[PDB]
């Protein structure tokens, strides 16, 4: 089998990208956020504290024949950007672009944080990272990508996402029309259960590139580019006027900059982030000054290749028994 669905951004800024799941029979159809640097599939539903929905469309399980609570497991997950969400769990039929895996765990929020509830486009996450990160207890459960995995044409699902445009998630399948030249394939770690693999360097603009290896994850579900202190600093010391403000949370640019290209290695390859890619607009409504999208990952603990550098590659999740990582250009 196979499945093929349309990944759009939520605004002009492509801060996240959602893409619609069919959950339950009939099928109720939400707009989730792949994510993989999670490994839980959870909703807003008729569960979720009512003060805390404003917008989002719910998963009624009560409404689904096929829906069944999943006796005593509830979970419960704090994001990187300090949101958070809990609830408890059913299984049910969830289908992504007619891929459709039985007995998913569909889990149901009982609870989200106020970034959950302020973004009404975003009616929960489907989590694409390895299963041994789900947070479900007593009984761990498995990703959508886990369960559907050997049914697929081939064990892999691959990230397509747009700059300012709608982009594609397939799952089984490599689409060889979405990509210019050859993919090439890196190796991935999952000792920290995410989809994490070395870059073999980066250039800034037209500069020469530095080859130095730079761990870091695939992670469709951060909006921004997290790399080392020294290398940000290397970027941003090519635009004038930018600095690294504590009081806005990150480097600001002047919003009448040209911003230059950022290039990461992958092997031998390289993939070249265009300079628009990075201009995360004003801070603030009518502000002159411009957020950045490749920020320090200095106290995150880890790089993250987020959807400023993902969305410049055709990006294959290869979950082969040793699973691997490739980009192409496009």
Known sequence: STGSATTTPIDSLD???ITPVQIGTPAQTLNLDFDTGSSDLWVFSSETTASE??????????????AKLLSGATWSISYGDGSSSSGDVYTDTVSVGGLTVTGQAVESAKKVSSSFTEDSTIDGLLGLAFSTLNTVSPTQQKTFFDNAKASLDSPVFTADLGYHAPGTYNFGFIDTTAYTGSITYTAVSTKQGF???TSTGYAVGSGTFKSTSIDGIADTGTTLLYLPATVVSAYWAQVSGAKSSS???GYVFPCSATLPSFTFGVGSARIVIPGDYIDFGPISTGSSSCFGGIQSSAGIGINIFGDVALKAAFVVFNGATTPTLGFASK
């Not at 929905?53 to 096929?66: E, F």
């Open 195 to 197: 989809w994490e693999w």
């Open 247 to 249: 009081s806005v949370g």
């Open 53 to 66: 929905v404003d917008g989002q469309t719910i998963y009624t399980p009560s409404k689904s024949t096929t």
């Open 15 to 17: 801060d996240a990208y």
